[PDB]
Amino acid sequence: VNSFSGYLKLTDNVYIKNADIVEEAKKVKPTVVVNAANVYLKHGGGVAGALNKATNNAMQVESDDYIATNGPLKVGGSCVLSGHNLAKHCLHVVGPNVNKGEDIQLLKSAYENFNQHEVLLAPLLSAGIFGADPIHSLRVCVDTVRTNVYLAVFDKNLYDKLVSSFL
Ligand SMILES: CC(C)(O)[C@H]1[C@H]2CC[C@H]2CN1c1ncnc2[nH]ccc12
């Protein structure tokens, strides 16, 4: 039993809710919140900007030190950093950016990072400004993640649609 309230059960291990990931994190304080990161951990907009803004830019400050030490992440890769006021940890995961021409097949590699954590609050990867189709992102998620994932989809029209076409 966990505290994730009001989630629809899609599969044995995937759950979904129409909610702002920032609000889910503030409410649940999960062990892991996933950020839809880029390779530079520049948290400008979308999920990352919203998460970072909610930390009062502390996520960005921490991230800049990470990059200075380690260099950019790989597309498909991840790193674990602090969750600040939102969660214990933030798993920064880089999905491929379709607008940059990055290989959508790297989306599966990106989701594999979730399997290192028993429970996660997460967005759909490669959606939004990353260019990919969220219905496809949900499919890859279901077919790749085996741990317990709670998807927060901050778009009621999209939330309702994802359910209606899910195979
Ligand atoms: C709708 C969505 C697919 O879930 C994505 C992407 C479309 C643009 C990105 C932001 N967004 C979010 N998702 C969940 N919590 C969020 N909080 C702030 C933004 C946000």
Closest CA to 124 of 114, 43, 115: 114
> What is the bridge-based pairing of β-strands 119-122 and 14-17?
unpaired
65 C-alpha to ligand 1 centroid (Å): 26
Tell me, in angstroms, the distance from the centre of ligand 1 to residue 71's CA: 26
CA distance 123 to 8: 15
AA identity, residue 151? L
DSSP summary character for residue 88: S
The shares of helix, strand and coil residues in the chain, as percent rounded to the nearest 5, are: 40, 20, 45
Q: Which residues contact 119 (CB under 8 A, 6 or more apart)?
A: 2, 30, 31, 32, 147, 148, 149, 150
Nearest-Å Rg of the Cα atoms of the chain is: 15
- Unique residue bearing structure tokens 């998460």: 51
Which of 21, 159, 161 most suits a substitution to test ligand 1, by most atoms within 8 Å of the C-beta? 21
Task: Specify whether the CB–CB gap between 86 and 47 falls below 8 A.
Answer: no
Residue 152's DSSP bridge partners are 17
Helix (H) or strand (E) holding 62: helix 58-70
Ligand 1, CB within 6 Å, residue ranges: 20-22, 46-47, 50, 123-124, 127-128, 134, 152-155, 158
Compute the distance between CA of residue 109 and CA of residue 120 in angstroms, rounded to an integer: 17
Q: Which of 38, 145, 29, 144 is nearest to 100 (CA)?
A: 38
Q: Which domains does the chain have, with CATH numbers?
A: 8-163 (3.40.220.10)
First vs last Cα of the chain: how many Å apart? Answer: 27
